Amino acid sequence: MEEKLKKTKIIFVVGGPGSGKGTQCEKIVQKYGYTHLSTGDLLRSEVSSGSARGKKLSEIMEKGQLVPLETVLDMLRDAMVAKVNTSKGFLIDGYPREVQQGEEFERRIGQPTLLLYVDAGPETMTQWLLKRNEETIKKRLETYYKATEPVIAFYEKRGIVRKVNAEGSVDSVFSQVCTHLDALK
């Protein structure tokens, strides 16, 4: 069955601002043959598709309303169905932002294999990079950390969280990423 979805590798990739997790996903693509997905890319793709789903989405966005999670997950699942025979695994870049988005992904598609937490860390030198006021930046970072900690705590209970220190270079981050992915199966 498309129960294959329950056997592929599914990595939730989570990181605050300045985390560079987009670059890490592509480096995982090059090395491990995974597929880089994000809900933003699928929405742009679908609107460009001219499909009825895309016309509705543009309407919702002309509406200024919210896109329903069910439609997001239809698109994620379609994209994963089309590549689970030809891909070694999937990166969900920037997902989930809340516990229930994670739980709804699991219901519709399959349970995550890992949650990769790419943490540039709070204000150490992340603050200075985020310009190029500075209390707009601190307000932004703490609201990220408040929203993301229940997601981390939730998946910590399953023991699938792998935390990556993203203070240093791109190369030192991908070093830790490969340690964590090399441990799978």
Side-chain angles (χ1 to χ4, degrees):
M1 325 179 214
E2 266 302 327
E3 170 140 37
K4 317 180 119 141
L5 295 173
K6 210 62 208 219
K7 287 146 185 65
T8 196
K9 277 141 185 37
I10 303 176
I11 316 302
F12 288 168
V13 179
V14 165
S19 66
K21 62 192 193 312
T23 286
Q24 301 294 321
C25 289
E26 282 303 319
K27 284 165 94 56
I28 291 160
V29 174
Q30 324 167 2
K31 176 167 182 167
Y32 294 91
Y34 285 30
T35 302
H36 182 184
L37 298 171
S38 73
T39 62
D41 176 38
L42 288 186
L43 275 153
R44 277 180 181 290
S45 175
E46 191 75 45
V47 174
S48 284
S49 148
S51 69
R53 198 199 264 145
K55 306 188 169 223
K56 182 39 176 280
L57 288 167
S58 286
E59 240 159 59
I60 310 169
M61 278 180 18
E62 230 45 58
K63 275 320 161 227
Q65 302 276 46
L66 293 190
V67 172
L69 184 63
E70 179 185 359
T71 305
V72 173
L73 290 175
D74 291 337
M75 294 188 276
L76 274 169
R77 178 175 207 279
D78 288 350
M80 277 177 291
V81 158
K83 292 206 177 323
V84 69
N85 285 321
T86 51
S87 188
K88 288 176 71 257
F90 297 88
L91 311 156
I92 328 301
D93 176 354
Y95 193 101
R97 297 188 276 211
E98 339 186 310
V99 162
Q100 56 159 64
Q101 283 184 342
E103 285 280 72
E104 281 291 280
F105 182 107
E106 174 159 345
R107 177 180 67 88
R108 292 291 317 285
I109 297 163
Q111 142 186 47
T113 317
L114 310 163
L115 195 142
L116 250 198
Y117 188 36
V118 183
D119 190 17
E123 264 141 344
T124 37
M125 54 161 310
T126 314
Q127 72 303 298
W128 189 95
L129 298 171
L130 288 166
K131 178 230 189 233
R132 308 144 203 107
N133 180 25
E134 312 162 351
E135 300 278 291
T136 83
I137 290 163
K138 184 185 96 151
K139 283 310 227 165
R140 204 199 167 197
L141 183 103
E142 327 179 305
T143 175
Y144 179 86
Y145 276 114
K146 62 97 196 146
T148 298
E149 267 311 316
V151 165
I152 298 302
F154 186 85
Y155 289 112
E156 284 268 37
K157 283 215 220 208
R158 306 205 195 160
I160 62 148
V161 175
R162 308 291 180 263
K163 307 203 172 192
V164 157
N165 181 359
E167 293 180 313
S169 76
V170 162
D171 285 346
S172 72
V173 176
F174 192 51
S175 268
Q176 303 162 71
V177 163
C178 296
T179 294
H180 297 316
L181 295 190
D182 283 345
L184 306 176
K185 186 177 220 349

